[PDB]
Design a protein around this ligand. Structure first.
Ligand SMILES: [K+]
Ligand SMILES: [K+]
Ligand SMILES: [K+]
Ligand SMILES: [Mg+2]
Ligand SMILES: [Mg+2]
Ligand SMILES: [Mg+2]
Ligand SMILES: [Mg+2]
Ligand SMILES: [Mg+2]
Ligand SMILES: [Mg+2]
Ligand SMILES: [Mg+2]
Ligand SMILES: [Mg+2]
Ligand SMILES: [Mg+2]
Ligand SMILES: [Mg+2]
Ligand SMILES: [Mg+2]
Ligand SMILES: [Mg+2]
Ligand SMILES: [Mg+2]
Ligand SMILES: [Mg+2]
Ligand SMILES: [Mg+2]
Ligand SMILES: [Mg+2]
Ligand SMILES: [Mg+2]
Lengths: 136, 121, 51, 93, 77, 116
RNA sequence: UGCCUGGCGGCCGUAGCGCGGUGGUCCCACCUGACCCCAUGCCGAACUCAGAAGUGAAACGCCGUAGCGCCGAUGGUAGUGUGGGGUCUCCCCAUGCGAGAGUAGGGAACUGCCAGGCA
RNA sequence: CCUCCUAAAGAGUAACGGAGGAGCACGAAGGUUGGCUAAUCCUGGUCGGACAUCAGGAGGUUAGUGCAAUGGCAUAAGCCA
RNA sequence: CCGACUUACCAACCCGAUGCAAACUGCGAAUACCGGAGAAUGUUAUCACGGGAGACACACGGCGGGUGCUAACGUCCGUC
């Protein structure tokens, strides 16, 4: 599952997740799975969805993952009180805004792309939509 | 003095036919000769060169005297010339090292100049 | 730290002194400096002494 | 392709969002040495024809003010997730 | 349990003290800064901690000037 | 790259004279000529000037790019500055060493009665 | 009054690079020598001096040329002050302000003082 | 005690919030005058190698700053006398 | 002493595309803040000095955030 090989800093402020996405076009492949909802995609979710769509295509065509989980999420252990420092990094997330193309695919029929992405979408916490490469 | 006087008589003359320069100022001149490693070889007292950095490898440090060099120019370079890196300049290894810097703006033009003085090739 | 306090005493015999620090190990030679003596109102040699 | 269009009275965010909340969208015609013309377009009409790859390649005619302006589609701002057009740049051919 | 952070220095109250067009007396600090974010223009001195101060009575003038487009502060006396 | 290197050498002093608001005796030297301009504090106005390209100075000289010629320009620019009543100047050596022809000019300029 | 060159400024890339020309009367440059003045942690390379046979080769200036850098609308978008609203982790409406990026396009700077050459 | 962030584009601003430093050094590493300009790589070159010093070019501060970080720094505040 | 073909191959630089950042910025608002000027309006609403205090456990709600699980009628700041 995806994770930055290095980071400048271990822990990151919670932040907020406002705005619409950058990277709203199918820029690499023919077909894309686009976020309609807003949220966090964990590295496990990204992997689960990748394995689903990959198995559907029977290792044919080509798959791009447009999102990368570069935000570390900390958690406090069970039965520890508030404070005493920030919790430990447990997993990595990508912040998703509406419009974000999550995955792209080329070298399959649309029919099979739609099925592969439907199987991937069922692994994700955010509402998605199938999209095609536009001429402009 | 032997080779300065011969540079302009013959070597300027021949190189002006070879490449067909528009001026003598196009001709390759021996600008300088630098003998990195010395004062019986050169006459000029050498300059003790020093380390630009430390290196984990040679057990050196920055500003350690790890070399020595002299920059023969003009009359004294001609008198030692008697005694290609890709823009005219040559370097001889002596089993010290030697360098001949030129105003030649080509690789064929440096070997034109040295070999016109009958430099061994 | 390493650096010890010293006084620079006026050579004019006014009693006037400056104070400074000195790395005694690296520099054991006595610090001597022309400084303004405000008693005689002249620059004179000052010389190191113990604080 | 022949697109019907009106000169936009109002410009800016409020005006533009009101257009799109009534199944229209703003566009701009610029290029040549004439002043830019800010136009409003019927959304469903243009969305239907821009489905064809010819819309973006061939010269189009904008019938605005009853006048025929020949243009190429220069840029399109799409809605981030919905299949809608926010804006089109047309360049006078 | 414990954390290895929990330190910070006192805030230094840097920044612009007199903005453009403000009438200052000579000696008045115009900006406190680290290094020369602003440079001393006409009738402005630069102190040892890069403090820019008025050397004349007059009005503060910020200007971008020279080949590096650096910010200068002057006093229009 | 001798001009750019010299303009780098010249800049500190020039900027200081601008800061001070000094009237500036600027010298320029070449291997053949030497020049002198008295420039106003603004930096944009030459008040008086004298050179060895000026035929009057040059026709009385042996060679225009020597210490003798430098002293001749020094006397000339100073004399002309004293006509306008420009007594107070600051010497801008313009990146050249205060030595030889530049010094010879400065010496003659002082000897006439410029106050630097 | 025009053209060329030098010096000093304004200005600080629409002004900078690249690439193709082009200039030596003057100016500029390289250049020519060094017991000298002064100089090289060695070297007249630089700095410095005494020069004027030679060349514009390099540099420099000038001219041309969008391959770049740079500048850059209009419109839309983002954000946002105030008031109001929702399904309130985020948005929307009224009103005011309104980018950044990108697009069309611009673009091979312009200008003051003094000096000299030439016409 | 210092530096950054949190800190909401003046200042200030909390938490057992997120990251690092200080408790010195230096009679030069201070003053001034004069001078100088970096990393890194490519091509060539005794030993010599990935990396020593030399030469040329590319590059243009990506170096440097007595010691953290930030802001500075070419007129250098960097380097030499 | 070397070399030469050769890779399920792993691949830096550079070039073109795509995103991401509290401790990134070749950009950059709204607001806020400082100063100047001018009306109207406001029981001087301002500043100084002096007599007398109280208070230094705050709470929730909105907005911007840290922390916590964008958990808490949680916790810690800013601002109303
Ligand atoms: K002040
Ligand atoms: K010193
Ligand atoms: K609150
Ligand atoms: Mg609005
Ligand atoms: Mg601080
Ligand atoms: Mg500047
Ligand atoms: Mg010479
Ligand atoms: Mg040429
Ligand atoms: Mg813009
Ligand atoms: Mg050009
Ligand atoms: Mg602040
Ligand atoms: Mg604020
Ligand atoms: Mg408070
Ligand atoms: Mg210093
Ligand atoms: Mg209390
Ligand atoms: Mg309390
Ligand atoms: Mg409170
Ligand atoms: Mg809140
Ligand atoms: Mg509470
Ligand atoms: Mg709460």
């Amino acid at each position: 599952m995806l994770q930055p090989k290095r980071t400048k800093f271990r822990k990151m402020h919670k932040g907020r997740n406002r705005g619409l996405a950058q990277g709203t076009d199918v820029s690499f492949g023919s077909f894309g799975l686009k976020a309609v909802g807003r949220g966090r995609l964990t590295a496990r979710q990204i992997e689960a969805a990748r394995r689903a769509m990959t198995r559907a295509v029977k290792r044919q065509g080509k798959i791009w993952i447009r999102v990368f989980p570069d935000k570390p999420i900390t958690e406090k252990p069970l039965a520890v009180r508030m404070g005493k420092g920030k919790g430990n990094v447990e997993y990595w997330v990508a912040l998703i805004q509406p419009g974000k193309v999550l995955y792209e695919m080329d070298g399959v029929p649309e029919e099979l792309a739609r099925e592969a992405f439907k199987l991937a979408a069922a692994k994700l916490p955010i509402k998605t939509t199938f999209v095609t490469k536009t001429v402009m | 003095a032997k080779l300065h006087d011969y540079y302009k008589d013959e070597v300027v003359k021949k190189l002006m036919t070879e490449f067909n320069y528009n001026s003598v100022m196009q001709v390759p001149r021996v600008e300088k000769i630098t003998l990195n490693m010395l004062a019986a070889i050169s006459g000029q007292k050498p300059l003790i060169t020093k380390a630009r950095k430390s290196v984990a490898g040679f057990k050196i440090r920055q500003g350690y005297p790890i070399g020595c060099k002299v920059t023969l120019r003009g009359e004294r370079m001609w008198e030692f010339f008697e005694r290609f890196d890709g823009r005219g300049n040559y370097s001889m290894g002596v089993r010290l090292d030697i360098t001949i810097t030129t105003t030649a703006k080509s690789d064929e033009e440096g070997r034109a100049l040295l070999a016109a003085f009958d430099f061994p090739f | 730290g390493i650096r010890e306090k010293i006084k620079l005493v006026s050579s004019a015999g006014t009693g006037h002194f400056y104070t400074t620090t000195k790395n005694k190990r690296t520099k054991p030679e006595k610090l001597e400096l022309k400084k303004f003596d405000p008693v005689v109102r002249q620059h004179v040699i000052y010389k190191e002494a113990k604080i | 392709f022949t697109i019907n269009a009106e000169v936009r009275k109002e410009q800016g965010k409020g005006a533009s969002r009101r257009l799109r909340a009534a199944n229209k969208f703003p566009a701009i015609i610029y290029g040549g040495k004439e002043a830019p013309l800010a136009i409003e377009l019927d959304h469903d009409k243009v969305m239907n024809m821009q489905a064809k790859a010819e819309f973006y390649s061939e010269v189009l005619t904008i019938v605005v003010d009853g006048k025929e302006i020949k243009v190429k589609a220069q840029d399109v701002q799409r809605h981030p997730y919905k299949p809608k057009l926010q804006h089109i740049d047309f360049v006078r051919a | 349990g414990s954390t290895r952070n929990g330190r910070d220095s006192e805030a230094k109250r840097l920044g612009v003290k007199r903005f453009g067009g403000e009438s200052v007396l000579a000696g008045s600090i115009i900006v406190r800064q680290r290094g020369t974010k602003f440079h001393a223009g006409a009738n402005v001195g630069c102190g040892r901690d890069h403090t820019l101060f008025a050397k004349a009575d007059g009005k503060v003038k910020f200007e971008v000037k020279g080949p590096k487009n650096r910010k200068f502060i002057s006093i229009e006396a | 790259d001798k001009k750019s290197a010299r303009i780098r050498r010249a800049t500190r002093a020039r900027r200081k004279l601008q800061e001070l608001g000094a009237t500036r005796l600027v010298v320029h030297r070449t291997p053949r000529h030497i020049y002198a301009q008295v420039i106003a504090p603004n930096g944009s106005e030459v008040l008086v000037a004298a050179s060895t390209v000026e035929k009057a100075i040059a026709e009385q000289l042996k060679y225009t790019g020597n210490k003798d010629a430098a002293a001749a320009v020094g006397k000339a620019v100073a004399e002309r500055a004293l006509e306008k009543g420009i007594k107070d100047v600051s010497f801008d050596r313009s990146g050249f060493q205060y030595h030889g022809r530049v010094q010879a000019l400065a010496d003659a300029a002082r000897e006439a009665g410029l106050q630097f």
